[PDB]
């Protein structure tokens, strides 16, 4: 087993991105080891929609995409095939026929500040309901009425982003969580991510 697939650069990363501007890293031409993620660590949730956690070192695909971001505590159930809310509607939509895994662990020591963390925003006030695996990073005043908003906020013109306020005393339902989503793709091509 000469080569090896870098997962410590996706999990043990210092800056870990935001929900409305989530980061994606393509993985290929490696030999991944899934016996160090399932059978280790402190991951609170390890849900594998599609295929099961075991027998994951057998199947091998063409590409794997890792999506990393940060959300609240009671907002991790909205990352699932289906589901409706405010994150699965305006920030990150997940297709109904999904093959992959969802991982999240409580990172409260690293993403909490006395007074409030001013990073980690999330999108609010959108028109449509987004599409699977689609990002939007535009910051334009949300026009909620007939009268146009000429770049100035006021009545029926709102900023489309709200800031998570993270403090070291918020209760488990509001503490930050770090989420990583792996997506397995077999698209009519020779595989390059085959296991040990």
């Amino acid at each position, epitope marked *: 087993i000469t080569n090896l697939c870098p997962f410590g650069e996706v999990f043990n990363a210092t800056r870990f991105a935001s929900v409305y501007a989530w980061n994606r890293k393509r993985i290929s031409n490696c030999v991944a080891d899934y016996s160090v993620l399932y059978n280790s660590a402190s991951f609170s949730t390890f849900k594998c929609y599609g295929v099961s956690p075991t027998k994951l070192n057998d199947l091998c695909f063409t590409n794997v995409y890792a999506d990393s971001f940060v959300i609240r505590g009671d907002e991790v159930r909205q990352i699932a095939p289906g589901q409706t809310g405010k994150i699965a509607d305006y920030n990150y939509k997940l297709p109904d026929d999904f093959t992959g895994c969802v991982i999240a662990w409580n990172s409260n020591n690293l993403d909490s500040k006395v007074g409030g963390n001013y990073n980690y925003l999330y999108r609010l*006030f959108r028109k449509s309901n987004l599409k699977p695996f689609e990002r939007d990073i535009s910051t334009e005043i949300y026009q*909620a009425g007939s009268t146009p908003c000429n770049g100035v906020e006021g009545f*029926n013109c709102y900023f489309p982003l709200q800031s998570y306020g993270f403090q070291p005393t918020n209760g488990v339902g509001y503490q930050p969580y770090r989420v990583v989503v792996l997506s397995f793709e077999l698209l009519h091509a020779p595989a390059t991510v085959c296991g040990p």
Partner: antibody, heavy 122, light 109 residues
Framework: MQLVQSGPEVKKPGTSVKVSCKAS????????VQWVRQARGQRLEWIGW????????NYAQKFQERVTITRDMSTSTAYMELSSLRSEDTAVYYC????????????????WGQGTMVTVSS | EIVLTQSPGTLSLSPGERATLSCRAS???????LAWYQQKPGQAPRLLIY???SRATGFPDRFSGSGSGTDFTLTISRLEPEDFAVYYC?????????FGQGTKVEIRR
């Protein structure tokens, strides 16, 4: 199509008071609620407004360090608190909000409350 | 806008006379951020025209409306009964928002 308020109250000078305004019949999530004031035989006055979604609030200059307006997204109810009551605050308080169905919203405050008489004295 | 002025203070004439409320104001204010109201005694204000020209649903015909930089007005083409009340202005496009003084229409007897 309603903004039902609380009942009348009679307070004492120096205390505080909270007034409710519950919405029904429209999507309260995307709207805005403003508060006004009127005495007996006098003209209307403005207090402040709050965005129901974001929660941002703006107050008048004379009511700035006396009034706080909360959100209470669940159950679709908005409040307002007045501190350090004086004998000149005997008035009727209203709440108004536009009609919103889905993402689109009305261009003005068409839904109005029913009033809440507040008397403060010895 | 920080102060609004409503003139004339009061009007009074028998039914069937066109009336022109005027709401001349301070430096400037955008259109489509001004509205009119009506309050009968012991009631809550209703919404009249809500864009300086766009009329509300409940009220019937005969209620017009104009607007400009500093001369807003409201013309009622006939003073038929159940239309004698107090009408207010408001601008909500420049904080802090403000109201006019209001003008009470009367009946000559």
């Amino acid at each position: 199509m309603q903004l039902v308020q609380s009942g009348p109250e009679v307070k004492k000078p120096g205390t505080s008071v909270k007034v409710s305004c519950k919405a029904s019949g429209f999507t309260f999530t995307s709207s805005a609620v403003q508060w006004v004031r009127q005495a007996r035989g006098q003209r209307l006055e403005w207090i402040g407004w709050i965005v129901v979604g974001s929660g941002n609030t703006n107050y008048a200059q004379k009511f700035q360090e006396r009034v706080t307006i909360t959100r209470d997204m669940s159950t679709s109810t908005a409040y307002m608190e007045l501190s350090s009551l004086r004998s000149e605050d005997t008035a009727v308080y209203y709440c108004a909000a536009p009609y919103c169905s889905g993402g689109s919203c009305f261009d003005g405050f068409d839904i109005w409350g029913q009033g809440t008489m507040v008397t403060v004295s010895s | 806008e920080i102060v609004l002025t409503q003139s004339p203070g009061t009007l009074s004439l028998s039914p069937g006379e066109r009336a022109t409320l005027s709401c001349r104001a301070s430096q400037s204010v955008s259109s489509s951020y001004l509205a009119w109201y009506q309050q009968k005694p012991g009631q809550a204000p209703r919404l009249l025209i809500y864009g300086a020209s766009s009329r509300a649903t409940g009220f019937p015909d005969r209620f017009s409306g104009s607007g400009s930089g500093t001369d807003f007005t409201l013309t009622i083409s006939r003073l038929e009964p159940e239309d004698f009340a107090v009408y207010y202005c408001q601008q909500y496009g420049n904080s802090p928002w403000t109201f006019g003084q209001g003008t009470k229409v009367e009946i000559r007897r």
